[PDB]
Amino acid sequence: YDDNATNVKAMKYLIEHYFDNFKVDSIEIIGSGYDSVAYLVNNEYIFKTKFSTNKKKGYAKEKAIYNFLNTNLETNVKIPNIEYSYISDELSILGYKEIKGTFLTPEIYSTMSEEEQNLLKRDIASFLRQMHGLDYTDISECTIDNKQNVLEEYILLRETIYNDLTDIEKDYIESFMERLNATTVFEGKKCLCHNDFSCNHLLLDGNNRLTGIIDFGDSGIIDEYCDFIYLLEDSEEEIGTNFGEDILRMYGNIDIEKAKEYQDIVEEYYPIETIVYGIKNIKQEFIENGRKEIYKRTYKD
Numbered sequence: 001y002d003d004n005a006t007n008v009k010a011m012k013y014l015i016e017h018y019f020d021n022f023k024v025d026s027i028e029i030i031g032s033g034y035d036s037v038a039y040l041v042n043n044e045y046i047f048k049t050k051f052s053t054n055k056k057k058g059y060a061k062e063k064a065i066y067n068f069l070n071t072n073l074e075t076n077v078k079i080p081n082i083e084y085s086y087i088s089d090e091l092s093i094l095g096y097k098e099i100k101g102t103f104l105t106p107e108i109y110s111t112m113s114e115e116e117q118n119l120l121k122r123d124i125a126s127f128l129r130q131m132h133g134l135d136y137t138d139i140s141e142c143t144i145d146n147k148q149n150v151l152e153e154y155i156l157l158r159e160t161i162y163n164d165l166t167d168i169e170k171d172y173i174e175s176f177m178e179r180l181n182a183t184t185v186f187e188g189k190k191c192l193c194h195n196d197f198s199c200n201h202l203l204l205d206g207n208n209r210l211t212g213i214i215d216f217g218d219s220g221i222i223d224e225y226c227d228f229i230y231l232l233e234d235s236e237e238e239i240g241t242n243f244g245e246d247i248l249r250m251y252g253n254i255d256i257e258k259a260k261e262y263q264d265i266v267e268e269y270y271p272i273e274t275i276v277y278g279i280k281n282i283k284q285e286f287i288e289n290g291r292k293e294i295y296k297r298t299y300k301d
């Protein structure tokens with residue numbers, strides 16, 4: 001919070017300016033990202049906002065995805081439904097009715113009965129099955145090639161800071177690139193994926209059932225494996241590897257060992273992704289964090 005509550009005031013002003021008949025009675029910051037801030041307005045609406053950003057056309061795609069899904073999905077699981085939007089280079093805002101519920105965490109999962117956990121898993125698999133099964137023709141432009149993206153990111157590294165890196169850093173990168181070249185995990189089914197499908201985006205109702213999913217801001221047509229990456233993740237923020245496995249078995253018709261290889265490859269990539277983000281957005285701290293993380297990983301066992 002600020003002394004002038006300046007942030008909330010500016011955003012109040014912008015919301016009321018751009019959405020002619022919209023009246024802000026209350027407004028608080030409910031989240032923030034790398035270059036975004038999310039607000040809860042009138043205890044009822046979520047407004048996601050961003051100023052000038054490296055990924056332009058970002059809130060436009062995300063909007064198009066919400067519209068495609070609200071038209072085409074048949075599910076009881078809620079997702080954002082965009083009522084207000086303002087999109088420009090210098091400012092983008094998306095407003096939708098807040099989905100009510102509690103975000104899944106490791107702690108909450110641990111308190112659930114075995115059966116509750118099973119049902120949650122079933123609900124997740126069933127949603128992913130339905131989304132991955134959609135004919136995505138009407139959003140065929142929202143395509144993401146991860147391998148190619150990584151190859152282009154590697155070139156950017158080589159054109160920028162690569163020569164200043166340590167040998168240890170270089171070896172980490174090259175060793176990953178060799179793995180990227182040898183793997184077959186990009187050669188499988190492509191489909192519409194959420195693509196940031198981690199438990200901080202999953203909402204539970206009062207019966208610990210899946211009631212909503214948020215933040216399709218990275219969604220697109222991509223490898224089917226993508227949506228299992230965080231479900232398979234072993235970390236403090238995610239539930240655990242067995243959670244993802246079970247979900248994969250419920251989901252069915254998918255090579256689990258390849259999903260894991262996909263996840264493991266993306267995990268290996270994370271510090272490099274972090275470096276790249278720092279380069280592209282001119283934020284040194286990200287470059288430094290990624291490089292340090294390479295050393296932590298190098299010295300792990």
Ligand SMILES: CN[C@@H]1[C@@H](O)[C@@H](O[C@@H]2[C@@H](O)[C@H](O[C@H]3O[C@H]([C@@H](C)NC)CC[C@H]3N)[C@@H](N)C[C@H]2N)OC[C@]1(C)O
Binds near residue numbers: 238267
């Ligand atoms: C903006 N969407 C995601 C971003 O949220 C972030 O994804 C995070 C992702 O970074 C996070 O995992 C990474 O970061 C973990 C921790 C440092 N997160 C703060 C440690 C493990 C590592 N795989 C996941 N547990 C949750 C996931 N939503 O990175 C990729 C991305 C495309 O920028």
Ligand SMILES: Nc1nc2c(ncn2[C@@H]2O[C@H](COP(=O)(O)OP(=O)(O)NP(=O)(O)O)[C@@H](O)[C@H]2O)c(=O)[nH]1
Binds near residue numbers: 034098
């Ligand atoms: N309860 C609830 N919270 C929401 C909803 N939409 C957004 N939020 C809150 O706002 C936060 C930020 O929303 P989100 O779409 O994830 O923002 P973002 O700009 O894409 N950031 P990031 O991609 O890093 O998660 C969420 O973590 C959550 O706290 C919603 O419908 N319901």
Ligand SMILES: [Cl-]
Binds near residue numbers: 284287288291
């Ligand atoms: Cl640095």
Ligand SMILES: [Mg+2]
Binds near residue numbers: 196215216217218
């Ligand atoms: Mg997001």
